[PDB]
A paper describes a structure:
Glyceraldehyde-3-phosphate dehydrogenase (GAPDH) is a highly conserved enzyme involved in the ubiquitous process of glycolysis and presents a loop (residues 208–215 of Escherichia coli GAPDH) in two alternative conformations (I and II). In the presence of inorganic phosphate (Pi), GAPDH catalyzes the conversion of D-glyceraldehyde-3-phosphate (G3P) to 1,3-diphosphoglycerate (BPG), accompanying the reduction of NAD+ to NADH. All the structures reported in this paper have four subunits: O, P, Q, and R. Each subunit contained two domains: the C-terminal catalytic domain and the N-terminal NAD+-binding domain. Two anion recognition sites, “Ps” and “Pi”, bind the C3 phosphate of G3P and inorganic phosphate, respectively.
In order to see whether Cys150 and His177 could affect enzyme activity and structure, we obtained mutants H177A, C150S, C150A, C150A+H177A, and C150S, whose structures were the most similar to that of the wild type. The enzymatic activity of wild-type EcGAPDH1 was 3.84 × 104 times higher than that of C150S and 8.13 × 103 times higher than that of H177A. These results indicate that C150 and H177 are essential for EcGAPDH1 activity.
Author numbering:
A (entry chain P), D (entry chain R): 1 to 333
B (entry chain Q): -1 to 333
C (entry chain O): 0 to 333
Amino acid sequence: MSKVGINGFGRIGRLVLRRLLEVKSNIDVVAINDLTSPKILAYLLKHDSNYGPFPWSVDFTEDSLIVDGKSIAVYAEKEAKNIPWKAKGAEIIVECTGFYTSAEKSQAHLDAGAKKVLISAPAGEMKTIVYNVNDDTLDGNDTIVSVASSTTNCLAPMAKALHDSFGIEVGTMTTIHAYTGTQSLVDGPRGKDLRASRAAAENIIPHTTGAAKAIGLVIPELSGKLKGHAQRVPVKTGSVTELVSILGKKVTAEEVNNALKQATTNNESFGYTDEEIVSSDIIGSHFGSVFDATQTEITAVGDLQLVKTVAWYDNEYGFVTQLIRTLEKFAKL
Amino acid sequence: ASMSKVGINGFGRIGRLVLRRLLEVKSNIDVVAINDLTSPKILAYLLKHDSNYGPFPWSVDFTEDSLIVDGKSIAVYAEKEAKNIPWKAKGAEIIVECTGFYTSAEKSQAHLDAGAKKVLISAPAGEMKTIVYNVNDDTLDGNDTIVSVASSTTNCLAPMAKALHDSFGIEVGTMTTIHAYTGTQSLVDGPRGKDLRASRAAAENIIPHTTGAAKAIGLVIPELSGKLKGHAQRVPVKTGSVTELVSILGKKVTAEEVNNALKQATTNNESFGYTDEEIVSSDIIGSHFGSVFDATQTEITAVGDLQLVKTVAWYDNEYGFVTQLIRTLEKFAKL
Amino acid sequence: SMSKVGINGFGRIGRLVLRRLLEVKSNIDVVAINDLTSPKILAYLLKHDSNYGPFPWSVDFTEDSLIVDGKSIAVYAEKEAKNIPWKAKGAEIIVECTGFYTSAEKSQAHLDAGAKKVLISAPAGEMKTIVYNVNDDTLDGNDTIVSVASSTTNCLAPMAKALHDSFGIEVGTMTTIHAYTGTQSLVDGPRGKDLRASRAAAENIIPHTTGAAKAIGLVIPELSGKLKGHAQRVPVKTGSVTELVSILGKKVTAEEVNNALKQATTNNESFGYTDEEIVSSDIIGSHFGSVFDATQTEITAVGDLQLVKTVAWYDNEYGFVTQLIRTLEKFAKL
Amino acid sequence: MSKVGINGFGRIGRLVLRRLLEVKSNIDVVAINDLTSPKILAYLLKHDSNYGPFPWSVDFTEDSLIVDGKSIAVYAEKEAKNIPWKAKGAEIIVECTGFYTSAEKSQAHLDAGAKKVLISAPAGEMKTIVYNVNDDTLDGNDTIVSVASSTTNCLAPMAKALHDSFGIEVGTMTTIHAYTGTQSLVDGPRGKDLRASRAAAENIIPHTTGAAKAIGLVIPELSGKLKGHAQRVPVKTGSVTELVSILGKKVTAEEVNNALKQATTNNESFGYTDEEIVSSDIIGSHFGSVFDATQTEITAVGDLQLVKTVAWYDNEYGFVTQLIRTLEKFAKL
Ligand SMILES: NC(=O)c1ccc[n+]([C@@H]2O[C@H](COP(=O)([O-])OP(=O)(O)OC[C@H]3O[C@@H](n4cnc5c(N)ncnc54)[C@H](O)[C@@H]3O)[C@@H](O)[C@H]2O)c1
Ligand SMILES: NC(=O)c1ccc[n+]([C@@H]2O[C@H](COP(=O)([O-])OP(=O)(O)OC[C@H]3O[C@@H](n4cnc5c(N)ncnc54)[C@H](O)[C@@H]3O)[C@@H](O)[C@H]2O)c1
Ligand SMILES: NC(=O)c1ccc[n+]([C@@H]2O[C@H](COP(=O)([O-])OP(=O)(O)OC[C@H]3O[C@@H](n4cnc5c(N)ncnc54)[C@H](O)[C@@H]3O)[C@@H](O)[C@H]2O)c1
Ligand SMILES: NC(=O)c1ccc[n+]([C@@H]2O[C@H](COP(=O)([O-])OP(=O)(O)OC[C@H]3O[C@@H](n4cnc5c(N)ncnc54)[C@H](O)[C@@H]3O)[C@@H](O)[C@H]2O)c1
Ligand SMILES: [Cl-]
Ligand SMILES: [Cl-]
Ligand SMILES: [Cl-]
Ligand SMILES: [Cl-]
Ligand SMILES: [Cl-]
Ligand SMILES: [Cl-]
């Protein structure tokens, strides 16, 4: 299985192609569905506000892109059940619209002639994969799978490390998170989420995220043990996740840091830093998550101990590297 | 006292500030109905909490079908097609059309078919009477039913062009506005209609953008038809904009002479202000003028008998423009 | 009453101190300002504010003064506090807003220069430190140099106090998502010894040390040593939010925590309550030191192990200034 | 000459080193003078908010940087006359502090034992070079030269092409310009300039530039014929210069754009675009100026004609590519 279609050629959809080209994948993107013209999709692929010029040639015709000399069909079907995936034989759909985040909704792609769907987002109780945490759970009979959120890909490897080394008894997460297209440019209606209606680049905006709540899909032993939320802030990409835990063991900072470093050794998904980085330094990262030893904090009074651990993530490109790792493995089962 | 009943179509950046300003000046206009695409709950939230102008100055509550503002009920509708808005239910006769989707005489006709009497469009709307208050509001009369107040940029450019034309003659000119980003632009890089540049992250770029302000200035100042062009550079400020005009004038001038002429034009002028202070864009946020001429930026470049004159005016493209809209509304309502 | 004030450092805080004093028609008169610049530049900065808009009163200047709402304010430019000629106009209480005199040892220079008392707008070591309506009762007539701690302290303390009083705080850690300030950098470049502080403040999320939690014991003695925390500086111009994750001395529900907080904010000029879905720009211009936000309360529990997250907004500029002024007024009458 | 010293390892200073390494120059930076430690300089070189991680290894010792395995001395001398340029034999100083922008001030480097100085800014009445406009004016007797400002490097090539093809009779420019370190993060004193006191990331701020005023040093024929100024705005780097001119004959937009296309042909200093780019697309440009045919505008009323031409520039890196070009030539004379 080598032929892919992308539904939603947005921030994530376009970076999916960029990354596949970058790693010289044997996956072949044959079709793209969105809501617009090839002309506009070509413009957006070529010029990127966060990552700069597309490294390959880009042209278009009235119904296709031509990327690095290869033709990619472009469709504009707002209902996935109408996407003509069989025309170019798209077998695996990378589902990056935000409108099909359940097994029932993504079933449309299979009805439309595809064989498998990989959803770029949480999608309820289905196989949900953070690469290098639970990718071994992908199965030859899986047809619809989720890679959860960027935040999940940031939290999970840190949570796995901690839990494996020390035990996590309970914990709460706050991500300080780059603004995304689900937010608003100027104050205006944005469905039922009132906070989402507020000007994103001019505000700190509290936001609900399921990353902690649904972590049991990725690390079953942590089911129900974590909660958390996001503060959306005015940076264009690059985010940071803080986790405050009660661990099963008394620890030093050096001990937590040492365990995290071991977990990141030879781990292409999970990086380590002890440099005093800031968010722009994570832009373009090829990890899902980069644990930051410099922010580790142990607060102890008598017998009680809280442990704060912190990890960076490029919620666009870093997350995409994870999605592609998952896609490559998925495509072979 | 004329008590005209008003309806607002599009309770957006402009539509919400229209209400704010009407209450602020204690207008005799009664806003009796609002049409948008959402619930009273959401509109109440947006009216109360404003990222640019802070807490609404009056109480705001909602019911299942209304806003209650300072104790007065305003019916809320959600008809995406204007012909279906029940403007007759609360007697809304003048519609302040602020959706961006009815910017022509043919499209705003739907408000009249739905039972309103008059429409004031908060944007350019092609070949119709187009009013910059204190420039050409004298051209209004009792027979007008659908009128435009043009763009924020027009409201900035027109008083400055008028003053220059009246004092010196403008022979030809070009404008560039360095302009706050607005809701027509994009939060993240993504399709935004057919304008390629408008697809790009607005808070992260300088983005060239076309504006008709200079091209259609002739609707406002007929003598300058076809003598002006220009465009915008959209930049990452949330509101507050500035318009530069480079002109060949009908006579040789000094900067002092230009500045004095502009000062005279702003004296006892509620619409057009003047400054010789070294202000920046956040200083214009909340302006009660459609335009403020900035004498500190005046520049004369002269070689032999050739002269280029650069004149610069700030504007709050949100609230400042709204003050112009309301002045035109209060006049248009009484005719 | 002491009634004559000098401001040292007519900066974000110093200018807003004057604004607030005139807004509340205090009987305190500002008779002198010291900074490093000209009256022209101070008048320009006072008239024009990027965060709060035009100054609400008339502003003019001479070669050695400001004239504000028709009242003359002397302007000095002495970089060393000991040299400031405070006695010329009888400045009694110095509001110290430069950031350069954050200790009793440093700020006593003002006294050498002829002042009677100093109120420092920042943490200043282990001196008496006041969060209004948390421990301002500890002030007395013998206090000569006093601190009002940081904006973050003023946000954190009334929340911690309410929780501690109702339920007990056994241990906790704070993270404040905090507007950038003048201590940061516009473009990437050296900013003393702190590496992170060198980075472009409007283009990054920047981890940053704060003493608010560490030194909370100056303000709430029973929590001495029980809290730690830090900041993430982010690109908003003012308006900040503080999260505290606590182990409490009692099993609780979110409603119970929210009700206790609501009670503590009733008839409390310093400490507000909200259950509206606000964002940071809605706190800009707040007249509170701290606004507890019920919408963000979260209780995470497995058996007897319970974490409690509580969240309060604060306008680190003006809201903090309202606290500084409340303290100042009281300080002036002891 | 192949040994360079950098004074002011700032935005421009650090990028100078980056660009020298990128083009594999035979110039070697042997010393750097600034106001801080090697540790802080190394941190700053390594992690860049605008251009991302440094492409070569960077380490530090107590007295130096190690960059790509080579040692560069670090000094911290506030006054240029005390800088030990002779210790490592620094021959040409790239003067990037902003405090020595005159022949008389930059003499202190020669007094301290350097042989030449290239100033990264306008520096009064001395030879002022925009590469591929007037670098032919340099000779072997020059010892202190200027490469003018970012805006000068943007303006000059566009003015040269217009004036050569059509004649410029008079003109005024406005650059819509990224904020720089001369501005203020929060409202507060910043020298005598009132507008420079105001928070740069939250305002449009009118600001002087002498690029047009002193354009005569670069294009003597245009001396006294141009004025202009800037509007500093909240983007981190990437700028755009508009020039409104009265030309020496009647033109069409196509005529202007073809003349500009021809001037940019085989021109390493000066680029052309007819794509609908925005400021983030110029970040990391290897040109001093990129003329933009999409924004050309002719306003004609009988005999009277205004011509508006627009060119992008990366005021950091793009400018630095011009600085290095001039540097490489200056080193050989
Ligand atoms: N941006 C992030 O940080 C991030 C990170 C991880 C996951 N995700 C997830 O990926 C998905 C996409 O996010 P994004 O940031 O790329 O969003 P985006 O808005 O940039 O892109 C969505 C794309 O889908 C297209 N689209 C919308 N509705 C459609 C439909 N019915 N049919 C076809 N195309 C349609 C749009 O035109 C757009 O090009 C979401 O589920 C999101 O939660 C986003
Ligand atoms: N700077 C400014 O923002 C500014 C200045 C002057 C004029 N204008 C003009 O005013 C108009 C509104 O601009 P804005 O910035 O308030 O835009 P906006 O997007 O903030 O508001 C538009 C509002 O209209 C609603 N809407 C959209 N389609 C609708 C429909 N069919 N029926 C009912 N409601 C609908 C939206 O839900 C939203 O509340 C545009 O014509 C614009 O050009 C804007
Ligand atoms: N900005 C905030 O959010 C905030 C909140 C609470 C407390 N604080 C504290 O208040 C103090 C001031 O902060 P700010 O944000 O107003 O800083 P700022 O940089 O805006 O103001 C500093 C002022 O002091 C002047 N100054 C510097 N050194 C001086 C000296 N030796 N003598 C006289 N004047 C001098 C400067 O010129 C400037 O006007 C600091 O201690 C800071 O921690 C700041
Ligand atoms: N930033 C731009 O866009 C740009 C473009 C073209 C030219 N320039 C010019 O280049 C020069 C540098 O600008 P920049 O943006 O890199 O400024 P910067 O502020 O980023 O760097 C200045 C550097 O010099 C150091 N410094 C200050 N005084 C010093 C001294 N006396 N001795 C040694 N080091 C000292 C600082 O610590 C800092 O590292 C200026 O003259 C500027 O006009 C800047
Ligand atoms: Cl949760
Ligand atoms: Cl989130
Ligand atoms: Cl035009
Ligand atoms: Cl701490
Ligand atoms: Cl802080
Ligand atoms: Cl000039």
